[PDB]
Amino acid sequence: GLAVELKQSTAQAHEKAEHSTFMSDLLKGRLGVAEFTRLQEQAWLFYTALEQAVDAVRASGFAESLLDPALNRAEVLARDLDKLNGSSEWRSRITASPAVIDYVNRLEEIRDNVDGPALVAHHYVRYLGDLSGGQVIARMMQRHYGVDPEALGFYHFEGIAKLKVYKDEYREKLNNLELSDEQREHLLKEATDAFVFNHQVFADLGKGL
Amino acid sequence: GLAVELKQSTAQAHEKAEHSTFMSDLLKGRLGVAEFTRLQEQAWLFYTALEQAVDAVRASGFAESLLDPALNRAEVLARDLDKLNGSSEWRSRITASPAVIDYVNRLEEIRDNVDGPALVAHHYVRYLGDLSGGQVIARMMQRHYGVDPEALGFYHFEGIAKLKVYKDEYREKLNNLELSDEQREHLLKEATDAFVFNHQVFADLGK
16 A cells, blocks of 8 residues: 555655754744744745646646645645735745755656656645644644634645545545556655655754754 | 643742842842842833733733733833933943843734733733732842832832732733633743743843
8 A cells, every 4th residue: 555655665754854953943832933934935935836736737637536626725825924924025025945946846847747656745745744733733833822823724624524534535545546666666755855855944944043 | 720820830930030049149138239220221121022012912902901001110110220320321221131132032022923822921920020029129129238219119010009909800810811722821831931031031140
């Protein structure tokens, strides 16, 4: 089963990304709403790129059931940033950190190559991550930084009644994807690369704090 | 209820802050009016930030009954400083210690995010301190160091007639303050942070 192999193959890079100093400090309450906002700004940049790549792969007829448009985060994230920042100023201010540039560049390569297996890897890392840990992170943002729950829309999936069932169904869709050995290896490799990109995003965010 | 949990949750940080060497030395008579004046100068910087956050949160409609404007200290404190320093010179001279920079930053972050629960935590730590330990401080600045009570206006709250009643009513307001679980957790978190900020102010004053 691909779902199990993905979880095992990515374990090392996943642990390292999740336990970055930036995220560790954020979740312990050692930073502030500013740092959470910077994170969400960088995320808006990479989710925008990710969702271009998802759109292309879905349109090609690959992994359609997995690529549920209800998962789209970019618009919801923009609304969160409007509230966090207090205006639309952020759109003209924000720019990609070096890690985000590299991450976006890869996502754009995947988009332009319509690389379905690689896209699924990135989709897993971001969306299954959001579905799995979103409630935890959101709770920490309220507990530590007093973030308005209305500005945590990113962590809420409107089109999904029950997260546990959805995550189980997601993993089964992974299992049922028709993939050649070459495609599966490509996907597994990409999933580790995706965790590494995210680790580097956190490293940039944490620099000089 | 909340008042009891707040006291219990903050107990360790509170004890550490209260028993700082600087504050301990000041209260027992080992220091002098100079050190008291340095403290009050730093306090004016953080009360200024605190009361900007209080004003923002009150205006937003949160915890109105708790955020009694009679508690405002900044103006009274500036007058104490004029007396202690002999003129307004202190305004252009004083600068925030490293600990006060961090404390002021948090208070400004609370103001900017109009973070009501966080504000209440900080309000409790300062003003209920002033209404209790502060009364001992005022008595001992006069007794140990001969500070004229005219320079201790900070510790006198006009329009507050009976402190025990005031404090009992404050705690009842805390108990009746409507909070989500997340807001309540945040208030508790922040209250411990507030004690720690104050401990650090004392540590810098010792240096």
